[PDB]
């Protein structure tokens, strides 16, 4: 069943991805697309505090930039849709130690969905429930199974256009978002073709076997936090070095200097 569980930073120059699958070397390429603007305000969410819970449902707008410097595999996937109930179709992405599962299905999501992890009395094996994420799943259309893609910052870009759902990802070692450039590589393109208006992050909680699991006293987890930003239609100038890797970019609307750079 469902269990009742319940700041801003600078984005600098993060959120650049490869616009197409064409190899280019040592060239300046201008492209109009949906990008996260430079030096924008990115919202920082503390999903779990110290235990205090706050995992809200956020709008999708024209695309989403997601970031997390987490190493405790608390964050496991995402939910996308419009009403997030049985009246419409929704998309669900779940990761674990061996695979990633993507499903377009008509789910009936709980108010506070999470993935429960159960450990055996002898510590040799465990299990994952997914019974607290949704109550029903019918009229199920799309399925996809692959290898998982989840001091270590992870960045994702989500777009939904032309009947395709596009995901780009990047993993980088760091030591609140850093400076510098790291272009996001294309991860997946799914021919899904649905409405997406809202989305919510999926977390994983462990079991405390001293109290029943239908209350907040039966689940425990560590602190988790993430960063969220939104994409807007902009013209960008990307630089491809000799190895075919994007190493710098210019936003043609940030300030008059950048506009002058793009004009030339």
């Amino acid at each position, epitope marked *: 069943q469902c269990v009742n569980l319940t700041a801003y930073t600078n984005s600098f120059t993060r959120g650049v991805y490869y616009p197409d699958k064409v190899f280019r070397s040592s060239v300046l390429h201008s492209t109009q697309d949906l990008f996260l603007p430079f030096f924008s305000n990115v919202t920082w969410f503390h999903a779990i505090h110290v235990k205090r819970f706050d995992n809200p449902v956020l709008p999708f707008n024209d695309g989403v930039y997601f970031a997390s410097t987490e190493k405790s595999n608390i964050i496991r996937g995402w939910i996308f849709g419009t009403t997030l109930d049985s009246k419409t179709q929704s998309l669900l992405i779940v990761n674990n130690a061996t695979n990633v599962v993507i499903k377009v299905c008509e789910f009936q999501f709980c108010n506070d969905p999470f993935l429960g992890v*159960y450990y*055996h*009395k002898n510590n040799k094996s465990w*299990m994952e429930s997914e*019974f607290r994420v949704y109550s*029903s799943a019918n009229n199920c259309t799309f399925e996809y199974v692959s290898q998982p893609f989840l001091k270590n910052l992870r960045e994702f870009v989500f777009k939904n256009i032309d009947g395709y759902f596009k995901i780009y990802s990047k993993h980088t070692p760091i030591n609140d978002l850093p400076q510098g450039f790291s272009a996001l590589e294309p991860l997946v393109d799914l021919p899904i073709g649905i409405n997406i208006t809202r989305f919510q992050t999926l977390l994983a909680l462990h079991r405390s*076997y001293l109290t*029943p699991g239908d209350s907040s006293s039966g689940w425990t987890a560590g602190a988790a936090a993430y960063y969220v930003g939104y994409l807007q239609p902009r013209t960008f100038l990307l630089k491809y070095n000799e190895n075919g890797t994007i190493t710098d970019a210019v936003d043609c609307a940030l300030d008059p200097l950048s506009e002058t750079k793009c004009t030339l």
Partner: antibody
Amino acid sequence: VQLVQSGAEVKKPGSSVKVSCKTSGVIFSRNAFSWVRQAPGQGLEWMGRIIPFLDVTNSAQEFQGRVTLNADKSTSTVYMELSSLRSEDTAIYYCARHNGDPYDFWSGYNTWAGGLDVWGQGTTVTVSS
Amino acid sequence: LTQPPSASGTPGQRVTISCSGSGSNIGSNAVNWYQQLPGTAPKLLIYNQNQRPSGVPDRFSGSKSGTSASLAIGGLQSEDEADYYCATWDDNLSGLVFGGGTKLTVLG
């Protein structure tokens, strides 16, 4: 939530009896079930547990090698089979749903096994000659 | 589990039923109580040692001390004559165990 059983059965000693309990779609696929027998004028007795979506079956000490519990995903039915009938095996058999966590049962924590909120109408088995 | 075979009392009073067990079943696992009218299937009254399912009034209260448990009914009503079962899980036997039947004969 409803649990529908089969009809009352009359059997001869030494034969075998099969009792069915039919459930809905979600309830069958998200629950663990127990089988409880009650003799006429006596107290309740436990016969076994079955989790159809994990393929794990527990058994009673007095019903090992004599009671077979199985399931079948189509039409969502859970079956119990009794063999080597005795003259005093006439009773009423109930299929009941656990309100606890089947994953808690799988992990080995049975501190909340014993709650049965939903029950079937009951199948009367008369074993006589 | 062990419990007395019969009980009685006058309407409007507070009656109690005991259930004594060992340390491997009652002292380690939560206790549950059931009500069974003579013409129907048993019904759950108390679970998780204190809770009541929706539709059950507030007159039924469960308690536990050490390796024994008790069920108390306040404001006894003329339609409360039935069998009450004390049920738990035994780790040694590894199975459900019921404490037997207790009958309340309400005179008046």
